[PDB]
Amino acid sequence: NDIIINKIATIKRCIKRIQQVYGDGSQFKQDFTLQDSVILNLQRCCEACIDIANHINRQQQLGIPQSSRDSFTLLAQNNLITQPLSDNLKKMVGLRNIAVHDYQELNLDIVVHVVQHHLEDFEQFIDVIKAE
Amino acid sequence: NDIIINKIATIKRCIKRIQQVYGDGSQFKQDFTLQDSVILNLQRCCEACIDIANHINRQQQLGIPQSSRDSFTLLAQNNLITQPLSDNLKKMVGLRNIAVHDYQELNLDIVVHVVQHHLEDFEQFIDVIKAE
Amino acid sequence: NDIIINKIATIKRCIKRIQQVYGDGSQFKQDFTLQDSVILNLQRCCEACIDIANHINRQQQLGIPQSSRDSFTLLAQNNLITQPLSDNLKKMVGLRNIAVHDYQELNLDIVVHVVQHHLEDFEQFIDVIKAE
Amino acid sequence: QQLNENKIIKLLRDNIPKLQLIYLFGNSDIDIAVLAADTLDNIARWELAQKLASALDSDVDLVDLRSASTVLCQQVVTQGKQLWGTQQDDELFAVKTISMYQHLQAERQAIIDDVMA
């Protein structure tokens, strides 16, 4: 299957882009261009994860996902992923919407927290989908 | 690496064969065996360049190639090869696909012009990859 | 079928080219140009047979093969060509890959033996596909 | 649905000179692929895609089968419904794409093996 390979490669590319543009974080909370790049690549990661989840739900006929969060609920119900991982991907779902607009004062701390604590969730989803 | 050394030697041998068989190019349009040899050695040069690029992409995880030309695009957008050299190698890959897949009548004037002005691109690629 | 007609015509022209360039074979192991010509025309024969196999597989809805050998495998599994002919064609594909990509020392004796005894496989494939 | 197909066919034919093939593959974007005697200009191709999207009231991706990658052409061959064009051109494009995709799968096997553990 080429779709899954390409989506996994895109998630890896965007994680590398986030880790590179962010660096150590000393310049991140100061420069808005780095923040824009990080936000865009985080949204790309989240969208690609949702795409993989939907494609696997349709492939193995796990069900019809009612939403983008329910697409991970379908994977979790059939024990394809663990409930904590599903809940973290659902967290990431709200990240893309919140970071679209330009409320900078709130989302900056949230974006920093996501970059520091939630890229491992994308990598873990990559790993658990890789075993298929 | 050793594979890169072998492929560089292969490219050098095939370039020497092209230069030896082509001569002054007067008998090219007349001798079909000469054309066959030149075409096969050009295809070999393209295959070796593609193999080098794919091995480098695999070594550094620059992504997966979506096409044979893409194997050099993944280099260009990583600042490993210049955009003109990348575009010229993609031209060579297009010529190779025309030659081996036969989805278009092969143009001999294009072959003559590539022999006269585009082996320099293979030697430039050798120069760039040798200082890995 | 016009596509099958054109591919068969290509195979016939390339068979005649192999037979004419090889001649009596007295200068084959000594002249690299004749070797290159015969290799290129054998590659053309192999690629045309592969294209015909892929067309017939898609046409009869037998499946889209992932490898070029898998197309002959599908033709054999659907009783369109015999297993010995399928294996012969797949080993011709292997010879072509050896000669082009150079992932093993090229044995000119195998090329000579194929010119002497294995063009009949291309002829038989043409005659079998013709009487569809 | 069939009424939507005719709009796509006529809109592409009225703006793509020397057009040969129109495939439809894929509530989001409508997935259309085209093959002509030339390669569409990138900016002009996107502009025509936006024109199609405005006419159909849904997003549209216009795939130029002459400059697209081998994987995308393979996907279009494997699932795309041919809207317009002769069957001869369809078969030619299909066999070209299948052969090139087989050779590519041979080319990029090590990378795929490495990235997929």
Numbering used by the authors:
A (entry chain D), B (entry chain C), C (entry chain B): 2 to 133
D (entry chain A): 2 to 27, 37 to 127
Paper text:
Our subsequent work demonstrated that the HEPN protein with a RX4–6H motif is the toxin which cleaves mRNA in vitro in the HEPN/MNT (SO_3166/SO_3165) TA pair in the model psychrotrophic bacterium Shewanella oneidensis. We found here that MntA antitoxin acts as an adenylyltransferase and catalyzes the transfer of three AMP moieties onto toxin HepT to block its toxicity, representing a new type of interaction between the toxin and the antitoxin.
We determined the crystal structures of HepT/MntA and HepTY104A/MntA at 3.08 and 2.6 Å, respectively. There were four molecules composed of one MntA polypeptide and three HepT polypeptides in one asymmetric unit (ASU), and the complex formed a hetero-octamer based on symmetry analysis; this result is consistent with our previous report. During structure determination, three regions of the unambiguous electron map connected to the hydroxyl group of Y104 in HepT were exclusively observed in the structure of WT HepT/MntA. In view of the above mentioned results, antitoxin MntA polyadenylylates toxin HepT, and in the final structure, a total of three AMP moieties linked by 3′-5′ phosphodiester bonds were accommodated in every region of the additional electron density map. Y104 of HepT was polyadenylylated, and a phosphodiester bond was formed by the α-phosphate of the first AMP (AMP1) and the hydroxyl group of Y104. Interestingly, detailed analysis of the AMP triplet moieties of the three HepT molecules in the ASU revealed that the orientation on Chains A or B was different from the one on Chain C. For clarity, the polyadenylylated structures of chain A of HepT and chain C of HepT were extracted. Furthermore, the highly conserved R70 that was located in the positively charged region of HepT forms hydrogen bonds with the first AMP moiety.
